[PDB]
Design a protein around this ligand. Structure first.
Ligand SMILES: Nc1ncnc2c1ncn2[C@@H]1O[C@H](COP(=O)(O)O)[C@@H](O)[C@H]1O
Lengths: 114, 115
C-alpha cells in the first residue's frame, strides 16, 4: 500500500516530510529539493506509477490533486500565481515512479518550462 | 457564449483555425502556435474556466479528464520516451491566455527546473 518508492514511505509515515495537507486519498508536502521559494508536491495515496498508465477511472482523483494543489497554493500565500507540473518518463525528467504534481511559486517562472 | 471570450473560445467554436488532435464533449486538444518542444500541444475544457485558481470543487472530473486526454494524445503522437505537463497560473506562472489549459511537451529532453 502506497507503493515501493520513497513517496510510499512518506505516505506510510515511515520517513519525515513537511506535510501541508492530507485527506483519505492524497497527500501534499514540501519538496526536499525546492526549485522555487515555494515548491511542494501533491500525490495520490493510490500507487499510480506514472501518468501514462492512469486509467479513466482515475479521472476524479487526478483532478482532486489539482484542486488540492490550488487550495494549498492559496493557503501558502501564492497570490501572484504559480506553475503546476507533471513529469512523465525519461524525457519528462520524472524522478520518482509514483505520480506527483509539482506546484512552484514565490518567483517568476520562465519559458520554456525546462 | 459556449467556450468564452478568449481566443481559445473562438478555437472551440471553429471561428479561428487550429490543428486539432482530439475533441469530445468536454475538451479539445490542439497544437501550440509557438512550440517549446518538438511536440507541444494544449488540452483545454470546452467550459470556460479563467484559471486554475478559480476552479470549483465539482470541476475535479473535468480537470482530471484534461490529464487523461493529455496522456492519451501523447501516446497517440508517439511520445514513448516521455513528456511534461504544465499549467501556468497568473503572473508568476506566466499565464497569457485566461482560459484554463494543460501544456503537453515532448520529443526532447526536458530540463530541471521547469522554468
Ligand atoms: N491561436 C493559438 N493557437 C494555438 N496556441 C496558441 C494560440 N494563441 C496562443 N497560444 C498558446 O497558448 C499558450 C498561452 O500561454 P500560457 O497562458 O502561459 O499557457 C502559449 O503557449 C501560446 O503559444
Amino acid at each position: 500500500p502506497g507503493g515501493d518508492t520513497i513517496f510510499g514511505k512518506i505516505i506510510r509515515k515511515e520517513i519525515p516530510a513537511k506535510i501541508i495537507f492530507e485527506d483519505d486519498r492524497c497527500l501534499a508536502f514540501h519538496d526536499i529539493s525546492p526549485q522555487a521559494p515555494t515548491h511542494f508536491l501533491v500525490i495520490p495515496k493510490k500507487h499510480i506509477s506514472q501518468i501514462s498508465v492512469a486509467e479513466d477511472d482515475d479521472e476524479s482523483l487526478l483532478g482532486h490533486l489539482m484542486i488540492v494543489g490550488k487550495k494549498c497554493a492559496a493557503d501558502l500565500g501564492l497570490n501572484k500565481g504559480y506553475r503546476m507540473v507533471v513529469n512523465e518518463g525519461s524525457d519528462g525528467g520524472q524522478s520518482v515512479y509514483h505520480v506527483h504534481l509539482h506546484v512552484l511559486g514565490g518567483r517568476q517562472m520562465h519559458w520554456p518550462p525546462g
